[PDB]
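User: Assemble these into one structure.

Assistant: Restating your components, then the assembled model:
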Amino acid sequence: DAFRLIDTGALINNLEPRQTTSNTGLLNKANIQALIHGLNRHYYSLNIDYHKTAKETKMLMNLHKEQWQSGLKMYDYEEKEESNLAATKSMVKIAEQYSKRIEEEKELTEEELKTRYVGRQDPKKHLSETADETLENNIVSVLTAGVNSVAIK
Amino acid sequence: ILDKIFYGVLDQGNGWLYVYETPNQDATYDSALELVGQLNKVVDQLFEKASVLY
Amino acid sequence: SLVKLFTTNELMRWPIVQKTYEPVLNEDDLAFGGEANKHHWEDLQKRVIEHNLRVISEYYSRITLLRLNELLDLTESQTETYISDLVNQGIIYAKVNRPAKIVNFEKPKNSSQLLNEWSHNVDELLEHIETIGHLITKEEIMH
Amino acid sequence: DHNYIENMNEMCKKINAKEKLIGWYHSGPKLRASDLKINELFKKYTQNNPLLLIVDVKQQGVGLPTDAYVAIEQVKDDGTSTEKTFLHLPCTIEAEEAEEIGVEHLLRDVRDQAAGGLSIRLTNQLKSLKGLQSKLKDVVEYLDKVINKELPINHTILGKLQDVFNLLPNLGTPDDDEIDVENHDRINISNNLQKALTVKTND
Amino acid sequence: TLEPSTSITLAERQQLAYDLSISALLGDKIYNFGELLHHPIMETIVNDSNYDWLFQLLNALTVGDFDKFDSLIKVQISKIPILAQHESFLRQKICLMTLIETVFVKNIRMLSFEDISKATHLPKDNVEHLVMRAISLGLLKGSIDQVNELVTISWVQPRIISGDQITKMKDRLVEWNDQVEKLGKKMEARGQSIWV
């Protein structure tokens, strides 16, 4: 945060509005009590913006030589095996919760439905997210193996 | 062989004993049967609930 | 020359090494020499044949049984007995076929094993074309 | 101005006395064999071989604009009576905790070196092929010049290419059979998961 | 690192060169026969009486001609008694040289035993000794299958890259350029919708 003194003289004659003229008025007001008291009775707090050239931006942004090469680098295959097995197993356990849920859960009063049938930590949604993340990955996995084989030989 | 303690097969007309020490079948495919298995129960339930709409 | 022989992987044949060391090392007492010691000289053969087998498993992945019997200068049945005994000690991993056709020395390749190795081969070529390029930049400077 | 370097240095150590002189940056574009002499000057001050870190300021391409080179004196099999030379060294980038958070605060891009979702990585597979092609092409036209335009026979370059041909993949190996087993596994799991999403949306 | 000074007498310079060649014949892992000719030490005097039979043995080994080795060897073994006492070492080098040459230039990484036997002018019994000796020296690594009568190499030791060979590399890479390239096109075209 950045600050610039105010003169006591300004505050005594109540001439302080001069310093806060023609502005958007966005002031950080985080931190109060003694700190804020001191600030109001001594300095003025105003915004900080960060300006940078696009030359600077690009140098920083650029990463490794091996960055643009990585797609033919591939995971060790013992880990892909492990991952395939973990996902099939996990969904099974949340699927139990989901079957129990739609036994009933067609009455009334929203919040009660969620406590009765464990609609909190909702199983349908948590399952839909895991199922898809794993599905997309497995497309990437195959894609790399086939390409590696064929491109090189 | 039948107890399973070397679990192989006896080739009678060639009078040789084949021994295979391969453990039980791949885990991954079996775990798929369990996942698909649940899903059938999910669908039966889904149709009853949906009967009201039809 | 004896110790280095038994720790090198050149194939040595019992009937040959025998004649060699008879007028030199067998004269010397202890282990060889005397009458008690001549009943120690005998065991030496065994040690040799079993050191040949250990090398042979690693180098020849498939070898015919018959060739092995000539090389070790042993009868077939005997040869078969020593192989079984060696697999037992766990030194080597082998599959012996009693119809006396072929002896297969094999290392189980689980699916992972071949794939991971192959993984490394692909990665290293990627690294090689990039590095080869770095040193090519330099050659332009020199010319 | 030699003297300047010593005067600057002592104030700088007060700030942080961990730091030591280790070499010099050169503002590119590109290596010179006049640098060999330059390097030697710095070596007087330094207790380690000075690093010549060519930070190229022209930022050509999106690839790293650092090559690193160190002056080493080595003997060589050709006949040369000791050669003095600059050997390429691998350049990577690491940033501190303090530094890293500055990089991310600055950036406002969507990013695409993230290699995150199906979309970024979809691009990334194509990007790598063409990445390779450009490099490969450079190797190829360079080989023509060696046996036609009398660029020296640099035995090191050729020597390295042998590993590439020896460790090149092969088909009809029982590895190839192995890849097919894996391919079936991954498509298999893909289908069970595909059906599983059909159920959720239908609810 | 030899002083550029020519103060070291020509007689001394040749004499030492001579020694290297003799060692290299009788060695077991040296294939720098070509290296010597690319170094000044031999390069500048190639007319001397000593440098007839001697250079010729070396070029004999390189191409793996056993008829050329035989003829020379009869004469030379007599002249120098060193080669007589190391008769076995000298006989082996021609054989070793030839098996590795053939494995390098052949692009397939398996070769039948029959090819080696005729190539090397040795019976088939002697093939199994030679591959075994070679894996042990570490010149090559691989496996021996007697039931497909193949020897599968999996590693080759670095070698000088002759002129002719520089041309070969270019060829393998040109072919691999086209493989990369044709593949990239399909994949550029398909899935056009998404590259963002």
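Chain C touches chain B at residues 99 (CB under 8 Å).
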